[PDB]
Structures are given as structure tokens and as C-alpha cells.
Design a protein around this ligand. Structure first.
Ligand SMILES: O=C(O)C1=C[C@@H](O)[C@@H](O)[C@H](O)C1
Length: 260
């Protein structure tokens, strides 16, 4: 039976658990799919082109992670769904010898919840991961405030029409976040401390261990959440696509939940 190759592009990449959850699905659904899928971590030079290399390795699909999501958006041949208004894609597909981009962090992060009760939120960090979040919450009608001491391309949220800050809003929020090329190892403990209190939900993109960020977070007897549930939702959605839509996301989501 056919070996179809896939992977997650990134740098760094060794800690990604995408291979675990996608391979659970390829094995589970090969009868329905009619090929053997194999998903693998691909560590990418920062200087390289995802496009040239996706074809070099003859992938059929792939995810994109830090820091290639916007670089990725550029080199598609076609871009579909919410991606058009995200300027970042996390999912690639060869369809008809055409490279097609999607973005699943959006919906992914959204489905990450669960009960449709919320009005606004505050996004620390100015990355592709946050771009799709913002844009994702707007669509789900929210009052979205971004905050990053970084500035360039912070216009995106501006052009998109949400409130941009380089100083914590003397305000009170239902969701705080973080999507920083920092965290390795955010914003000063105090500016943080004050905001965190009377927040409705905490939430960190990152998964694996407990981050400085959340480590504290929970400590303050707060409702919390980490990247796990999102990782799975956005993967199941990318899988649906990988399956050229033969496998529904939510079926994938069950298989994936039950290994990780
Ligand atoms: O760690 C991972 O494998 C991933 C993380 C997120 O950025 C996702 O958007 C990406 O598709 C996969």
C-alpha cells in the first residue's frame, strides 16, 4: 500500500507532539484512506523556503509552526478559508500538484471551548499564532485587545481593528493569552500580577510542561488551560484536510485525544 509522507515544519521542532497524534490517525484510518500516512518532524533552516522543500521531500501535506507561518502564507499557490484574512497558515496540502494553505489555529483555538459565554480578551504577543487567534475571536464577535511591547507588523491587528497596547489596559478581561518568541524562558511580574486578578480564564498556547507564565497563573487559584486541547483541535482539523476530507475532524479528534 502507498506511503504518503507528511510532517510538521518548524525550528525548533523536537518537542512537537504532532507526529504522535497524526500517526495515531494514519494508522487508525488507513482502511478508509487507502494509503499509509507517515508524519515526521522536520527541522528547517531559517533561511530555507518551505515551498521548495515541501516538493523536494514529496510531501502530501504538512503543518507549519514557529516561525514559518507567515513566510508560509507567502509561498502558497492558493489559500483557503479564514487563512485569507490571517496572513499566516499552519497547514499545507498538495491538491492537484497545487500547494494550498489553510489555517486551523483559528477555529482550533476557538473550539478549545466549550461554552459560548465571553465578551472580550487580551493577547500578549505579536506572532502568527496570535494573528489567527485574534482574527478568530473577532469572527466569533469579541472585543479583542492585543498587547506587545514589540511593534512592527502590529499594524495587522490595527488594520484588522482591535485595540493595540504597549501598556496593560487599566481594564478587566475574560481571557489573557501569550504568544511570544520569548517564554524561552513575558511581561514583568507586576504588570502581569495586576491583570491576572479577577480574570475569568487563563490560557497558554505552549504545551508540555508548566511555563513560568502559567506556573504562577494557577498558583493564584485561577481557572486555567494550556495548549494541549488546542493542539488537538487544530490537528484534527488539519487531518480532515490531509484526508482530502474523507475523515471528519471530530473522528480524528477522538483518536488523537486518546493517545496524548
Ligand atoms: O507543536 C506543533 O506541532 C504545532 C503547534 C501549533 O503552532 C500548530 O499551529 C501547528 O500546526 C502544530
Amino acid at each position: 500500500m502507498k506511503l504518503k509522507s507528511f510532517g510538521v515544519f518548524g525550528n525548533p521542532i523536537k518537542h512537537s507532539k504532532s507526529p504522535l497524534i497524526h500517526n495515531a490517525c494514519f494508522l487508525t484510518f488507513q482502511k478508509k484512506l487507502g494509503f499509509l500516512g507517515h508524519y515526521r518532524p522536520i527541522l528547517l533552516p531559517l533561511e530555507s523556503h518551505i515551498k521548495n522543500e515541501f516538493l523536494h521531500l514529496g510531501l502530501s501535506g504538512a503543518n507549519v509552526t514557529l516561525p514559518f507561518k507567515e513566510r508560509a502564507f507567502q509561498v502558497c499557490d492558493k489559500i483557503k478559508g479564514i487563512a485569507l484574512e490571517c496572513a499566516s497558515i499552519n497547514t499545507l496540502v498538495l491538491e492537484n500538484d497545487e500547494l494550498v494553505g489553510y489555517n486551523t489555529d483559528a477555529l482550533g483555538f476557538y473550539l478549545s471551548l466549550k461554552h459560548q459565554n465571553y465578551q472580550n480578551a487580551l493577547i500578549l504577543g505579536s506572532g502568527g499564532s496570535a494573528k489567527a487567534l485574534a482574527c478568530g475571536l473577532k469572527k466569533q464577535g469579541l472585543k479583542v485587545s492585543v498587547l506587545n511591547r514589540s511593534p512592527r507588523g502590529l499594524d495587522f491587528f490595527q488594520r484588522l481593528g482591535c485595540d493595540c497596547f504597549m501598556e496593560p489596559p487599566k481594564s478587566a478581561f475574560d481571557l489573557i493569552i501569550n504568544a511570544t518568541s520569548a517564554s524561552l524562558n513575558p511581561l514583568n511580574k507586576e504588570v502581569l500580577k495586576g491583570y491576572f486578578k479577577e480574570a475569568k480564564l487563563a490560557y497558554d498556547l505552549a504545551y508540555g510542561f508548566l511555563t513560568p507564565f502559567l506556573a504562577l497563573a494557577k498558583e493564584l487559584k485561577i481557572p486555567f488551560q494550556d495548549g494541549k486541547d488546542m493542539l488537538i483541535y487544530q490537528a484534527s482539523l488539519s487531518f480532515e484536510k490531509f484526508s482530502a476530507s474523507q475523515i471528519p475532524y471530530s473522528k480524528a479528534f477522538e483518536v488523537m485525544r486518546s493517545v496524548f
